[PDB]
Every structure is written in C-alpha cells, then in structure tokens.
Amino acid sequence: GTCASWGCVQAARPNPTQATPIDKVITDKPIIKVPGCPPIPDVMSAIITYMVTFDRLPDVDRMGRPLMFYGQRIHDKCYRRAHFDAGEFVQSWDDDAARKGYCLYKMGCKGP
Amino acid sequence: NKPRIPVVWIHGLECTGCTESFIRSAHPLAKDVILSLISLDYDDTLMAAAGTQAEEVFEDIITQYNGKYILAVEGNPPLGEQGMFCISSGRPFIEKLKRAAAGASAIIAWGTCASWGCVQAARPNPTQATPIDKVITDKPIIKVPGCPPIPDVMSAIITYMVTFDRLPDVDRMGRPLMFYGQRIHDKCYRRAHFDAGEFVQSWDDDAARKGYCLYKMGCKGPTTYNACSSTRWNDGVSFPIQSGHGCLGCAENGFWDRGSFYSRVVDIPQMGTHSTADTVGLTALGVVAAAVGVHA
Amino acid sequence: STQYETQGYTINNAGRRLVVDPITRIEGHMRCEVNINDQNVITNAVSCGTMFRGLEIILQGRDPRDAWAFVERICGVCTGVHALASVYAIEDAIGIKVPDNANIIRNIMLATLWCHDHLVHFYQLAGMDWIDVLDALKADPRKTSELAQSLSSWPKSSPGYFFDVQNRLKKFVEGGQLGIFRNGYWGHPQYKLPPEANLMGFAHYLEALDFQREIVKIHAVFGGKNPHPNWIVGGMPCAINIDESGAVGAVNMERLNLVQSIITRTADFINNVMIPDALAIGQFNKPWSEIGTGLSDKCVLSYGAFPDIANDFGEKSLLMPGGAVINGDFNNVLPVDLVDPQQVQEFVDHAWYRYPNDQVGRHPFDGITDPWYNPGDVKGSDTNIQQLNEQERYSWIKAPRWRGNAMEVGPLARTLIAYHKGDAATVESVDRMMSALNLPLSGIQSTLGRILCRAHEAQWAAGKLQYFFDKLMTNLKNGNLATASTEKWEPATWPTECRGVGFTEAPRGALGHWAAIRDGKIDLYQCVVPTTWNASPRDPKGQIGAYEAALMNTKMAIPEQPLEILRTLHSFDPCLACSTH
Amino acid sequence: ELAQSLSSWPKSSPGYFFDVQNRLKKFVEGGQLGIFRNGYWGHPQYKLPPEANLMGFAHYLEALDFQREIVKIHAVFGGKNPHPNWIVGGMPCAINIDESGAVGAVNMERLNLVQSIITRTADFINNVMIPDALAIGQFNKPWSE
Numbered sequence A: 001g002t003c004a005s006w007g008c009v010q011a012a013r014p015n016p017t018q019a020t021p022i023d024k025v026i027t028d029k030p031i032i033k034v035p036g037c038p039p040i041p042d043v044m045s046a047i048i049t050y051m052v053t054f055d056r057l058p059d060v061d062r063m064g065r066p067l068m069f070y071g072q073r074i075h076d077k078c079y080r081r082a083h084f085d086a087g088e089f090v091q092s093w094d095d096d097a098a099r100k101g102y103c104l105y106k107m108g109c110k111g112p
Numbered sequence B: 001n002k003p004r005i006p007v008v009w010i011h012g013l014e015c016t017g018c019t020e021s022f023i024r025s026a027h028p029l030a031k032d033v034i035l036s037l038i039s040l041d042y043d044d045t046l047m048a049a050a051g052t053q054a055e056e057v058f059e060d061i062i063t064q065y066n067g068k069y070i071l072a073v074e075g076n077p078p079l080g081e082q083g084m085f086c087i088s089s090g091r092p093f094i095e096k097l098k099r100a101a102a103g104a105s106a107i108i109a110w111g112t113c114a115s116w117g118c119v120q121a122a123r124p125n126p127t128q129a130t131p132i133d134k135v136i137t138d139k140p141i142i143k144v145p146g147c148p149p150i151p152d153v154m155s156a157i158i159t160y161m162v163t164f165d166r167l168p169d170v171d172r173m174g175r176p177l178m179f180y181g182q183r184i185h186d187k188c189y190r191r192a193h194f195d196a197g198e199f200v201q202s203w204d205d206d207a208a209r210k211g212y213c214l215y216k217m218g219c220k221g222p223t224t225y226n227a228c229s230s231t232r233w234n235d236g237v238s239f240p241i242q243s244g245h246g247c248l249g250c251a252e253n254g255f256w257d258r259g260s261f262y263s264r265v266v267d268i269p270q271m272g273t274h275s276t277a278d279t280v281g282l283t284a285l286g287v288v289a290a291a292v293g294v295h296a
Numbered sequence C: 001s002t003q004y005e006t007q008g009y010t011i012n013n014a015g016r017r018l019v020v021d022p023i024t025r026i027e028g029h030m031r032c033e034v035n036i037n038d039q040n041v042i043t044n045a046v047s048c049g050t051m052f053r054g055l056e057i058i059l060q061g062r063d064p065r066d067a068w069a070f071v072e073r074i075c076g077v078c079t080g081v082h083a084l085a086s087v088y089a090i091e092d093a094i095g096i097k098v099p100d101n102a103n104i105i106r107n108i109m110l111a112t113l114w115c116h117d118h119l120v121h122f123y124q125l126a127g128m129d130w131i132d133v134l135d136a137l138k139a140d141p142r143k144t145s146e147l148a149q150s151l152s153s154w155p156k157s158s159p160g161y162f163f164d165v166q167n168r169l170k171k172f173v174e175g176g177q178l179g180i181f182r183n184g185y186w187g188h189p190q191y192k193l194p195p196e197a198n199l200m201g202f203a204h205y206l207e208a209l210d211f212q213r214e215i216v217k218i219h220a221v222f223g224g225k226n227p228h229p230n231w232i233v234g235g236m237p238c239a240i241n242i243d244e245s246g247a248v249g250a251v252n253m254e255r256l257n258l259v260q261s262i263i264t265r266t267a268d269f270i271n272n273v274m275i276p277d278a279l280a281i282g283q284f285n286k287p288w289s290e291i292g293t294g295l296s297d298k299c300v301l302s303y304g305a306f307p308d309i310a311n312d313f314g315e316k317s318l319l320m321p322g323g324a325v326i327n328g329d330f331n332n333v334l335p336v337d338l339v340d341p342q343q344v345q346e347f348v349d350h351a352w353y354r355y356p357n358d359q360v361g362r363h364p365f366d367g368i369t370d371p372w373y374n375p376g377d378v379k380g381s382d383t384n385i386q387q388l389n390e391q392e393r394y395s396w397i398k399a400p401r402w403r404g405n406a407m408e409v410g411p412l413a414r415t416l417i418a419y420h421k422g423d424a425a426t427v428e429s430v431d432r433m434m435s436a437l438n439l440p441l442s443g444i445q446s447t448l449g450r451i452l453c454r455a456h457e458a459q460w461a462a463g464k465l466q467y468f469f470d471k472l473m474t475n476l477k478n479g480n481l482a483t484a485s486t487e488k489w490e491p492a493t494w495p496t497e498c499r500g501v502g503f504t505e506a507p508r509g510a511l512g513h514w515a516a517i518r519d520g521k522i523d524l525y526q527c528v529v530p531t532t533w534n535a536s537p538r539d540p541k542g543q544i545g546a547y548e549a550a551l552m553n554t555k556m557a558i559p560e561q562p563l564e565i566l567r568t569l570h571s572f573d574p575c576l577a578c579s580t581h
Numbered sequence D: 001e002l003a004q005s006l007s008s009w010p011k012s013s014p015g016y017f018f019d020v021q022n023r024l025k026k027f028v029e030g031g032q033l034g035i036f037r038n039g040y041w042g043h044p045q046y047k048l049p050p051e052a053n054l055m056g057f058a059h060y061l062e063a064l065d066f067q068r069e070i071v072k073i074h075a076v077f078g079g080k081n082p083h084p085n086w087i088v089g090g091m092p093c094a095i096n097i098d099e100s101g102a103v104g105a106v107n108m109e110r111l112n113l114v115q116s117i118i119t120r121t122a123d124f125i126n127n128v129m130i131p132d133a134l135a136i137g138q139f140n141k142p143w144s145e
Ligand code: SF4
Pocket: A074, A075, A076, A078, A079, A080, A081, A082, A084, A102, A103, A104, A105, A109, A110, A111, A112
C-alpha cells in the first residue's frame, strides 16, 4: 500500500507523527513497493504467486513498483478515454453526462 | 403465490449459441430466471417432451395464453425451397413462426440471426435466410443483436421487462438503448492508444504485449453498437478486444460481408496525437538538419 | 412394405409408423421415424436432419484467415471446435508452424469445451431421460442425503438442502406452470431410479446448470468470450506479458491465476458430482448396458486429438488416440489418413443434395454441396411431410463412410479405440469403472455405455486441463512467451495454390475440415462433422448409420411415448447444426 | 451429523469434513503451523467437542472465502472495497436504466449483480453464522455470566 510505500494519509500535512515510508528507514534491503490505498486484491495475490512460482522478485520501475501492474497509468487504459478526447465531460454530479458515463476529468479525476 | 409470464422460445436456422449464452447468465442465474421470473413454456433445447408431446405443449400454450405470452425467437426462417431448408413437424419452420407470432404480445429477436440474418444470410445466402422483422410486420420486435449477445445483457433485458412490466426503449432499428446506445469504440479501454496512434501492427509484437489498439488489425469497434467494452463477457471476465482480437462487428447487420475481419474500418476519423506530433517534430528536426548539413 | 438385410440387421418398414418431430433436448433440428412390429419392437429406423444453412457455400471466395470465424458459427454448443479445425486446416494448407504456447492454449480451449459440453449434455440434455423429475417430489430428504453421502464426497448433501430443493420444485409445479417439465414422460415404466435418486439427480441438474457458466471463463481469458471465442491463423491473439510494463493489457499472472482457479473447480465438480451420478444411473439402469449397441461393436472411428508436440499430428503426439475398427475386429486398429481419397467419402443418394453420380462417394477434396430438396412421395406434400421416404432422399445430412464402412464416432468410439490400442490410463479407467458396476467390458458398447464414456471423458479432459496449464507455466518460467507466428500472415507469402486438412476430436466425435486455397482465396471448403457420421442417412448399398443401427431391435413399452428412442438418440449427443452446417 | 442437526446449510457431507480435516492435518504435519502457532490450544476453557471444532474450522474457511463476495455491493455503488467512494450531496454512482449510455452507469445488469449478492449473503449468515453462534452459546453457557 501507499502507507509503507510513500506515507499515505498520516503523512499528509502536517504529518503530526512524522510518519515515514519504509524505504526511508530501511536502506540495505530490496524493497518492492506495491502502492494503492489499498492495492487491488488480485494484484496483491498475483505479485505473491509470481514470486513463489518464478522464485524471483518482479521487475520494478525506477520507483520500486512492479512493472506488471504499475507500468501504465489509469488514464492509459480507461474505458472512458473516448469521452475525454472527444471533450465530453461530467460537469456536475448526476447530470446527463454522468448518466451516460462521460469522462470525469473536470470532476477532478487524477487518472492522468 | 404469483403466476409467471408465459414465454415461448422457438428456433429457426441457428447455431444455438444464443441459447447457450442465455444459460451463462451470472445474475440472475438462468436457473432462477426459469424458476422465478418467467414461465419458459416451450423451448426445444431444454424441454422434456418431444415429438407429438412437444406439439401438444406448443398448441396448448399459444391457445390458452393467446395474446399474453412473450415470443422469443432464436435463428431465422429460410425462404428457399418453399421453406423446407428448416423443417419442424414436417412443415416449413416459417409456419410455426407465424403461428407463434400471431398470439404473442411482444417478440424478442435473440442474436444477429433473428435480428439481421447472421452467417447463413452471408453471400450468397443459399437458403434465403430472412430476419424476423422482414417476415413479421404487425408485432413489436425487440432486436437483441450479437453473435451471441452478452449473457448478462440477455438476462438484464429479461429482468427489465419482468420488473418494470414493459418493453425497453429502442433505437430506430429496434435495439434496446440501454446496451446498444453506444459504440464499442466509445467505451473501449484501449482508446488511449487509438487516440495516441499506438497500434498493434502484427500479432504478438511489443505493441500487442502492452495491449495497444487493434484498429490496424481490423477492429470493427468504431462501427459496432454493443456493451462488450463496458459490461464485458462471462461475468465481466473479458471481451474480444481485451483478449487481443479486434471486434468482428458481430452485433451489426451483415457484418459477415463487410470485408475481411483483418481489414481496417473505413470512414472513421483517426488522427493520433503522439503519432502526429512525432511527425511534426521530425519534419522540423529534419528540415533544420538538412540546412545545417548534418542530414540523415 | 419392403425388407432387406444389412450389417446383421433386418430392415423392415411394414407395420405401424411412428414419427418424432421435433426431437427435443438436442442441438438443432432432427426428425426421427420408426416402424414397430406387433411386439412393439423397432424394425425400421429413419434419421433425418431437418435444417441446412450452407456454410461450405458461404466460404467460397473469402480470405482463409477469416474462415475460422465463419465456421465457428456452425455450432454454438460445441463452440470453438470448428475454429480449431479451421486454423488447423489453413495452417496445414499454407505450411504454418505455431509456437508452443499457442498449441498448449488451443489444447486448453478444447479441453475446456469437452468439460463444459459433456457436463451440460449429461444434465440439461440427456438427464431427464433417466431422472424422473416429478417423482423427486415423493422422496424422503433424509435418505436422499444418505444416498448422496454414500456415493460421493461432494459437500452439498444435507437433508435440509434436499428438502429445500424438493420444496422449490413443489412450489414451481403447484401453479400448473410446469414449464420445461410439462407433458413429459414422468411415470413411464422405464424410469427406474428410486425417488431419492431422482431428487439427488434433479438437485445436481440445478447445480450443473449454475456451475457450467464458470467453466467457460477459461475461454473468456484466452479467447475473449464464450460462446464463440476468437482465434488466429498462426496461433492465438492472446499475447502474454508476465513481468514487463503494460502486462495489464495482456495475459498476465492475474489472468492465469483465474484460469487455474477455474480448472480446480471444474475437476472438483466433474469428479464428485457428474461421475458419481453417471455410475448411479448405471446402477439403476443396468439392462440398458445391452440396449442400443448399434455399430459400436462393429465399426468405430477416431481421428485423434490434443497434439502434445506442437505442429505434430502424428501418433507419438496426439494425447487422444486416433484409429478405425471395422467388422468388429478390435484387435486390429487401423490407421486413418484424411488425404487418402479411398478412406473418407460422402454419399448423397439418400440426402437432399446433388452429385454428377449419386452412386459414388466423394472425398471432401472432391466434395460438392449442391442443395436439392427432393423428398419424393411423402404421403403429404413438399411442404407437408407425413412420412419420409427412406427408399430415396430423406435428409439434409450427407452420408459419410470410411473405406465404404458405416462408422460410429464419439466418446464411446474413442474409448474403444484408446482401450484396444492399449492406452494404459484408459484401460485402467474403463476397467475400474466397469468393475464398479459389475458389468463386463461389452456393457460399454451400448446406450448406457455412451453416457458412461462421456462422463469418463469429462474427467479425462479435466485432468488434461491441469497438465496443459502446467506445461504453459513451465514455458513462461523458461521465458518462452511467443503465442503467434506471423512469418506467413500476409497472403503474398502463401503458395498460389495449396490445400490442407484440419482434424480433431470434437465432444461428439471425429471432425474434419478440408480446405483448398487459390490466389489467396478459399476455393473449396468441405466439412465432415461428427453428427454427420452418426446421424447419416443410408448409402447406395443401403447401409445404415449409427443412429438407425442403435435404434434397431429396440423394445418400446408405450409406442406413443418415445422415451426409449429419446434415450438412445440422446446418448449420442446429437448436434444437428453441426451435422448439416 | 452435528452440522445437519443444527442447519439447513448444504455443505455438510462426511467426505467434506474429512477433506477439511485432512487439509489441516497436512498443513500442520510440516511444523509450519502459521497463524495457529503457539496458540492456546488445549486450554481448559476450550469447551467444544472435537466435532464442533471441525465444524467451526470448516465454517471459518467458508467465511474466509465468502466474505470477499459481500463487498461486491460496495464495488458496484462505490467503485471498490476497501475504501469505496462517496460525495457530499449524495452518491457519485449515477443511475441509467432505460436510456442510451446506460452501459456507463448503474444499470439493470449492475443491479442484478447487487441482488444476487444480497440473497447469497443472507443465506450464508442465516445458515452458517447464526447456527454457529447458537452452538458456541450452547457449549459456553457460563460465559453468559
Ligand atoms: S480523466 Fe479519468 S475518467 Fe477521464 S478518461 Fe482519464 S482516467 Fe478516465
């Protein structure tokens, strides 16, 4: 998750407790970051099965995240991309746009 | 208790893929549809009675429940050879169809077969297979196309009609707006790649292994109305594009005769953002490299 | 009145004529007619395919790479098998070799189909021939529980559970809306299960109807959707990516995890529900180990299937053995060649087609599909068949023969072939299975035996699923990921003129596609399908096909109630759209 | 026999409990007791007969599996579980039953899924959890004080 990977909610301003991600504390061990709040259930298990079956750590990006599930962005595989590029957006909750499943970019989607 | 609405399910020329799809339903299970939502009173694929016993059931249902049953039609009637390309009880199937439709309140046309004609109607249509709406003209017909339609779409349409006690709203073509209102291409999770100009060019290239768009492999998503890209197949496990093959266009009328499945769709606007901007950059970089004298 | 002798049978069409049209709980359209003597014994049997679409005609002129998609629509029940045969044929013609993973996945697609198809047929199609559904309302739940728990380790067996099932059924019928159970054959003297066995059977019918939807999820992963998954000439389109960026867009670890979960559950359901139910039906219907033998003790055929060595369709590769037996000589299993013009041939003298000379058979490379509806005098009219004329043309199904011999195909045929070729697993399996019923090996050559062999095949296929999956994972562990060969994808790389054969064992038997390519287009495409063999009409020698043979000499307890006819026909698992295409 | 005396639940065959017992026996025979290691097993306050313990443990496994299904209702209306999504002013899951683009909203098919989960959840709770709670009650009555 985001907690061990980055810091997550407790590390947000003003981080009252000085919550620190693991890789800031442990610096002499291979650390596989599986972020998300929480990560996808089947992603968690697929990573586990991979390590058991293939007897190796998954290849990771420059941030220590497994390329298999974190190599691309949400926006790169979102089924509402057709609306995004067409400029078809939900502008307020439960408008006709929302009822047709238009893009949520103007509602603040951080998929990109 | 409560009576369930009587349903008569007849079969013309078909592959029985639509019936198979129906029983794949994840929610509600086909078991519960048959047990609790409807009364499946006639269906050659599943019923115990055969022959003259089957005929008696058929006659009894359409007579007793005349004007009150739903007619579900899988497959289509052939007009060739006086209709004897499809024979039921020693007579042309079309006679059964007409007799069934005359007493129905409404008709469901399951799949591309009943809706349009599907594979048997492809060039040269040896049997003159004809969609239901070309034969029956005086009854509401709801077209639920696809080869076959999505299992959960089928059941959802059934549950809708039971629960809301009415027919689903339809386009000019008779397809339910709910699942056929939009194109595969307008809800495809690979649009990002389409829009960027990132395409699979040959099977199992690096593009294919990253799940890039299948437009250049012949995907007919851009011209096909269906729910496969949102609802998905077999309890949302997958759909054609997700498993690496382009849409064949199987929900669309005469899709068999729209050229090769591996031929690109035409008259679909397509200008990639990153493909165009990469060109613009190299065009400009190459113009300058020529003038400076570091060409190539 | 006519009478003649063939294959040990005396075909006599004197006496009362019985017509079963439509045949229900089958795929597609079939009509059966029989004659019975004074002793209510069948003396004449007529198998009629009452549908035709003409796929072989539709494919002419098309691109060989599109072929699989057209022919897949031959049948939605055995969905996928025709597509497999198709890519086999086109790859054979052009000379394409697919990568190992592509072969393994295709094997998985076939095994999955076997599991699903056999399971659904057992319960939803053949089942109500053996299970008296309405009699289940008379059972005692506590003994139903005892019975089930005495037969299997399946968890779902509580008295409360069976009581719930019986209760729903009771409610269902109480309204008079019997649905699929209306006007059935309930109470027929040939229904031999005790009420407790009927309740157990019906409960499992429901469990199978539910679970079957899960099995095909394997098709959805590798082929996008079921029914009618997708395939490509050169391999499979389901690219694999385990450990690299963008694995989210391909077959990844999570995807394979799903496949593995379905395999385990499928083997679990087949082994502990279907298998014990099959044995159970055998226990209470032992006389039917001697009814509907037909051609199964005389002539059986298998092409073979499941090549474990990629692109090798030889005997050292096929996990499901091929071969032919004729004249009841099972000690001499003969090799099959689908190119040999003297082996597989199709006759149309008793079918609604046209040949230059209907007195000779044509190998599919010389095949002709020219529809000619010509029923003769049928005691009615061209649009009103009261009685088929079996003297002449009576079916949309062609009459295939092997070296002139009428053959039975399917699970029973394959089992006999595999057994007599000395396949250790099959020998043991059959032996074990027959021991349990206290029946001789000959008991398998029957209506009951077909059903028993089908169930055993499902178990066999379920086991193979795991084997293939492990084989795939082994490749991935070794970094072997390739799923497609595109070296010869472009028509420009094809021979100007070529031909090939694609064959496999479909759920219902030996399937073959014969394809000729000329200038990048389909020139000829001919299909000989399993039900084409079994439901075959007669040939110029008057030899009868597997259905008509199996129905011969059958005793009927009530002539107007064709339960016996149904039992035998359903044991073959007729797919009529397959047979006619 | 114990399970069947307490509930209508179908999963109660001798073969089933034997299988569960074997899986557990195999599991421990390796010395790798996992979450069971250094437990309080054999404590005098443990009052269930061996059969009730086997029934209980089997149901523990069944609950572990089935709990994942319940939260699918959260996934439909709130996108994901754990931590579904909400908005001030209502819920973001717009509903479309009968109009074009229903594929992009909560539709009949989505609702059908929700209904299927509700039925299964009530069925598990009423016939597994409830009787087990009642059973623990029967064998641990002093703890009512
Ligand atoms: S911005 Fe968000 S809603 Fe819009 S297409 Fe991208 S990921 Fe989807």
